[model samples]
Target: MLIFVHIIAPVISGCAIAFFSYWLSRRNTK
Candidate 1:
């Protein structure tokens, strides 16, 4: 559980944030 929270969640979160940001950046190139 500790490793899951410390690594799994973070890696998933990082990927989501990174992917979402790039998508939005391109979609709303203002």
Candidate 2:
């Protein structure tokens, strides 16, 4: 379980960051 969380955390965070970045850029263009 610990190992699974460690692996999943980075993947989830990376995807969240990418999504936030795209959202911010889209908002800025408006």
Candidate 3:
């Protein structure tokens, strides 16, 4: 429902941001 979506949305986005950050760091190092 609405509450579930609200809670899950941030977790998903947070993971996405973390993954992108890791990817960018590797790209920079290479």
Candidate 4:
């Protein structure tokens, strides 16, 4: 499933960035 991981690499990072940004903003806002 390496290729499956590769296929979803962008998706994986999008979620990663999404999660990080959401948490970062929450932390910063407080």
Candidate 5:
């Protein structure tokens, strides 16, 4: 459904951004 998609999209994007940020920080530390 459209509503479900809208709700999930931001959560997925936020998690993706957080994961990428964490990865970048770890790479910088190493």
Candidate 6:
């Protein structure tokens, strides 16, 4: 379970950062 969580954690975080960055850029343009 620890290894599974560790693997999935970075994917989750990477997606979160991607969305957050997209939102920030969109907001900046408005």
The sequence of per-residue lDDT tens digits that candidate 1 reaches over residues 1-30 is 689779977788888987888888998763
**Model 2 TM-score relative to the real fold:** 0.47
Q: How many residue pairs clash in each candidate?
A: 0, 0, 0, 0, 0, 0
For 1-30, candidate 5 gives per-residue lDDT tens digits of: 787988788878878987788888897762
- What is each predicted model's overall lDDT from 0 to 1? 0.81, 0.81, 0.81, 0.77, 0.80, 0.80
Pairs that collide, model 3: none
Better of 2 and 6 by lDDT: 2
Please estimate how well model 2 matches the true structure, expressed as its whole-model Cα lDDT.
Answer: 0.81
- Candidate 3 residue 4 Cα shift, in angstroms, is 4.5
The collision pairs in model 6 are none
**Which stretch of 10 consecutive residues in model 3 shows the poorest summed lDDT?**
21-30
Alpha-carbon runs more than 4 Å astray in model 4: 1-10
Error of 1 at 21 (Å): 0.1
- Candidate 4 per-residue lDDT over residues 1-30, each given as its tens digit: 688978688778877987788787897662
Q: Which stretches of candidate 1 lie over 4 Å from their true place?
A: 1-11
For model 6, the local distance difference test gives 0.80
Position 9, candidate 6: lDDT: 83
State in Å the error of residue 7, model 4.
Answer: 4.4
